[model samples]
Target chain A: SEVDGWLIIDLP
Target chain B: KFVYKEEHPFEKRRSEGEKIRKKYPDRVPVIVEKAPKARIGDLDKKKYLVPSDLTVGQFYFLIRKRIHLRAEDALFFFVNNVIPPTSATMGQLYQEHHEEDFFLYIAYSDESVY
Candidate 1:
């Protein structure tokens, strides 16, 4: 799981 | 029951307001749809009048507050069934995925992302 600048989009 | 707050002259001198106005007007129409498993209080599938410059995070909180959803609950928003960044602006999303009526449709879900 990688975190972006201001948001986090994860694949569950 | 949206409240309009005035911006101060000094704060207006900054670049935020001007930049937003350049890309979008004052308001835009937004349509929110709740997923089958999501309980969004009494919100119907309709257009919501909101600020054009509102951020995705802001809109998320607005819905949470309006629908009285607990902060501990899991809530997610998606456009065209794809997750968008919280930093995304309402105007940007609307411009990209607006319907024929120029309304941006947002899908919400309490279940896992789909």
Candidate 2:
């Protein structure tokens, strides 16, 4: 996914 | 190693970039976008036909100008998420990194990368 990350809130 | 593919079918993009190259040999076809976490405005236009001789550093400034970003705002380009040398020429970058689709996909972000 293109190194894409749906950065979740409050999580690293 | 992360590379983003375009929505256009591989064959079509290959043909389009090939066609563009023939039409303008000195121009390199590029698609520029911003990373999700990079607090920046959308590009006026994502697709660019850049001069072959232009350096990555020059291209970086061009986008900075386009987005009105400050001088040391931590702008960076990622080719499949791997940073390229700023001293490289656009044509060289294209030849070295352009995908099978023939378009050089570059993503920008505002981060403290030195």
Q: Estimate each model's TM-score.
A: 0.63, 0.79
Candidate 2 per-residue lDDT over residues B31-94, each given as its tens digit: 8888667776666656777778888888888788888887667788988777889999888999
Stretches of candidate 2 exceeding 4 Å from the true structure: A1-12, B1-6, B112-114
Q: For model 2, what is the error of residue B113's alpha carbon versus the real structure, in angstroms, after optimal superposition?
A: 6.9
Highest TM-score: give the candidate number.
Answer: 2
Could you tell me how far off, in angstroms, the CA of residue B71 lies in candidate 1 after the best superposition? 1.7
Model 2 captures what fraction of native contacts?
0.00
- Evaluated with lDDT, which candidate comes out highest? 2
TM-score of chain B of each: 0.69, 0.86
Q: What is the per-residue lDDT of model 1 for residues B4-31, given as tens digits with 9 covering 90 to 100?
A: 1122232532343344335446655565
**Stretches of model 1 off by over 4 angstroms after superposition:** A1-12, B1-24, B39-45
